[PDB]
């Protein structure tokens, strides 16, 4: 029960925070960005790196 102004700005800062975490520690696998996908029953976060074998 939060307004749409705050809700969309919250997901912006959520993306911004989660991008900084991925770029700080996953540097040595070639992290080149992140995508977040809200969905019924689940949120999905697609990490984009180069050494994908290393992130697994």
């Amino acid at each position: 029960l939060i307004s749409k102004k705050r809700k969309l700005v919250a997901d912006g800062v959520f993306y911004a925070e989660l991008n900084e975490f991925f770029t700080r520690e996953l540097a040595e696998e070639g992290y080149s960005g992140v995508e977040v996908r809200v969905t019924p029953t689940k949120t999905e976060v697609i990490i984009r790196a180069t050494r994908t074998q290393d992130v697994l």
Partner: protein, 53 residues
Amino acid sequence: ENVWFSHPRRYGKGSRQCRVCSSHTGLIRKYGLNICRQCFREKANDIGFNKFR
């Protein structure tokens, strides 16, 4: 002793800080994001704020 960290911090510049760099000055509290003015300007593009005009 209990006297440590006992002064109230419920209002005023001492209650809030930048969620990125924990600074007190130049905070941006509009729309509830609470990032300092120099850190928001570095993060505005990936939050979703853009320059048009």
